Design a binder for this molecule. Sequence first.
Ligand SMILES: *[C@@H]1O[C@H](CO[C@@H]2O[C@@H](C)[C@@H](O)[C@@H](O)[C@@H]2O)[C@@H](O[C@@H]2O[C@H](CO)[C@@H](O[C@@H]3O[C@H](CO[C@H]4O[C@H](CO)[C@@H](O)[C@H](O)[C@@H]4O[C@@H]4O[C@H](CO)[C@@H](O[C@@H]5O[C@H](CO)[C@H](O)[C@H](O)[C@H]5O)[C@H](O)[C@H]4NC(C)=O)[C@@H](O)[C@H](O[C@H]4O[C@H](CO)[C@@H](O)[C@H](O)[C@@H]4O)[C@@H]3O)[C@H](O)[C@H]2NC(C)=O)[C@H](O)[C@H]1NC(C)=O
Ligand SMILES: *[C@@H]1O[C@H](CO[C@@H]2O[C@@H](C)[C@@H](O)[C@@H](O)[C@@H]2O)[C@@H](O[C@@H]2O[C@H](CO)[C@@H](O[C@@H]3O[C@H](CO[C@H]4O[C@H](CO)[C@@H](O)[C@H](O)[C@@H]4O[C@@H]4O[C@H](CO)[C@@H](O[C@@H]5O[C@H](CO)[C@H](O)[C@H](O)[C@H]5O)[C@H](O)[C@H]4NC(C)=O)[C@@H](O)[C@H](O[C@H]4O[C@H](CO)[C@@H](O)[C@H](O)[C@@H]4O)[C@@H]3O)[C@H](O)[C@H]2NC(C)=O)[C@H](O)[C@H]1NC(C)=O
Lengths: 207, 209
Amino acid sequence: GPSVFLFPPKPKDTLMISRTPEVTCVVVDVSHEDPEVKFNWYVDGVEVHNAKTKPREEQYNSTYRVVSVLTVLHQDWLNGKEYKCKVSNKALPAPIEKTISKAKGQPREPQVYTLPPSRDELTKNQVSLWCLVEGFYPSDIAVEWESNGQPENNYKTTPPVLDSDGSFFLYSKLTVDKSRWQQGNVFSCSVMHEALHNHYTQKSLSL
Amino acid sequence: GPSVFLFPPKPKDTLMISRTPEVTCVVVDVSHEDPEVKFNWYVDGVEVHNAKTKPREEQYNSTYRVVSVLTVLHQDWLNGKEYKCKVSNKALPAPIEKTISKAKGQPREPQVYTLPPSRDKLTKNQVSLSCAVKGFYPSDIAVEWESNGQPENNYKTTPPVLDSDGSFFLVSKLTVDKSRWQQGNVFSCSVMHEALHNHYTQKSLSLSP
Ligand SMILES: *[C@@H]1O[C@H](CO[C@@H]2O[C@@H](C)[C@@H](O)[C@@H](O)[C@@H]2O)[C@@H](O[C@@H]2O[C@H](CO)[C@@H](O[C@@H]3O[C@H](CO[C@H]4O[C@H](CO)[C@@H](O)[C@H](O)[C@@H]4O[C@@H]4O[C@H](CO)[C@@H](O[C@@H]5O[C@H](CO)[C@H](O)[C@H](O)[C@H]5O)[C@H](O)[C@H]4NC(C)=O)[C@@H](O)[C@H](O[C@H]4O[C@H](CO)[C@@H](O)[C@H](O)[C@@H]4O)[C@@H]3O)[C@H](O)[C@H]2NC(C)=O)[C@H](O)[C@H]1NC(C)=O
Ligand SMILES: *[C@@H]1O[C@H](CO[C@@H]2O[C@@H](C)[C@@H](O)[C@@H](O)[C@@H]2O)[C@@H](O[C@@H]2O[C@H](CO)[C@@H](O[C@@H]3O[C@H](CO[C@H]4O[C@H](CO)[C@@H](O)[C@H](O)[C@@H]4O[C@@H]4O[C@H](CO)[C@@H](O[C@@H]5O[C@H](CO)[C@H](O)[C@H](O)[C@H]5O)[C@H](O)[C@H]4NC(C)=O)[C@@H](O)[C@H](O[C@H]4O[C@H](CO)[C@@H](O)[C@H](O)[C@@H]4O)[C@@H]3O)[C@H](O)[C@H]2NC(C)=O)[C@H](O)[C@H]1NC(C)=O
């Protein structure tokens, strides 16, 4: 029978009020013999009716893939409400039920520190700027770099690491031309997390 | 029927001549009816005879577990030789073969940088010292901290992260009581990797007035 996978919104979508967070229910292996899928959606066990189900679409293993998308309210997600997808198909013994919610646990505020390049490194032609983010919980987070209001996207960020106190830390490494650094340009690490005021902080770094 | 799991040596063990790297071939779900198990070991397809095999040990699920350990030459592992464990048992249709070797790819030398605490952290009680290791390949690496001739307990290291140029980086975070940092104590990040001279390099950090 078919399989169902339920996916959360993007952290940045739940944290920025301008954005629209979505929960996504994906049904795979819908065979031709029975192509019809019914989605029932529930928030905290109360059924809701505003999900939008997409035109089911045929895959190369020649079976079907069906997707329903439910817009969530930012504060519902952040307040820990549970989102249940129920998938009904002729070919199932019983309907499939998947439930998802925000990672549980007492929130803890990220501490954000920018670290300049090592001396050592001032001899190649690029330098590494570092954004250390530590002490946060849960691990859902968004970390971005910019300069003069523009995204600097030539960076890589480690996954969150569980630290000895049960909080998480990570490191974002931004690589820039050494000339940009030596000439005094200002670079900024932006962090978005539920435990921050306005879900947002920015820390800047320059020579 | 029985199942076989073949485990590699730890990276540090292959990089330090004083340590003993081993490949471990583990057989589980050996029956009471057919308890005999034979190991044959091959290095690049050439049979070798010096493995040390343990007596079978019964588990709480009434099956046996049997382990054979092959000591490997550091340089054989680092030169990419293939280690094959072949397991024979009368309950099996044919012997089970498993093969393992070091991760492949052109080695690249890690660059190691220590990063002092942010000033923002100095009013916190504990400060975080950073050891950034970048540009290395393959991802097998060991990173350790010490001070004053003893290891430091209180550090965590990120997994290797694939960078935009195809190499890996990571960072190691050592948390210390702020007094010890202000004290002037020297802390040292040691990195062990196949592409380092002597498979080892160390960088140190202490408060700069
Ligand atoms: C027939 O084919 C289909 C499809 O095959 C694929 O497509 C074809 C064309 C070829 O390219 C194939 O090579 C492909 O495989 C097969 O369907 C697959 O079935 C698998 C099960 O057998 C299933 O495995 C499970 O995957 C989960 C993760 O899936 C993620 O991530 C992968 C990437 O690694 C990706 O392929 C999936 O699409 C899915 O991606 C996420 O999608 C969601 C939904 O859109 C995204 O979230 C939304 O995104 C939007 C913006 O896009 C917005 O942000 C919304 O707000 C947000 O909600 C999300 O961003 C995507 N993430 C990523 C990373 O891409 C696993 O988690 C799961 O693990 C389970 O088991 C684990 C241990 O085993 C457990 O620990 C764990 O808890 C889980 O329980 C499974 O491994 C594949 O996902 C599925 N592929 C697709 C495309 O649906 C089908 O099986 C095959 N049939 C046969 C008979 O072979
Ligand atoms: C009957 O019982 C046996 C025994 O189990 C015990 O007794 C039972 C009754 C219960 O009480 C259990 O709770 C007990 O543990 C069962 O045997 C198990 O069978 C499993 C398969 O069915 C098998 O699963 C596979 O596990 C692999 C990981 O094994 C690691 O890690 C686990 C911990 O997570 C650990 O328990 C294992 O012992 C093994 O530990 C590693 O050992 C190696 C070798 O010693 C270590 O490497 C050496 O270390 C030294 C120094 O320490 C030196 O560095 C050497 O250089 C080096 O070689 C290594 O450090 C250890 N690692 C860790 C983390 O400790 C998985 O990889 C594997 O996954 C793969 O295959 C899967 C499919 O099976 C895939 O899904 C997957 O993707 C992978 O491809 C399996 O999950 C168990 O290991 C095995 N347990 C033991 C103890 O052998 C038996 O199943 C059961 N039968 C029945 C019918 O019920």
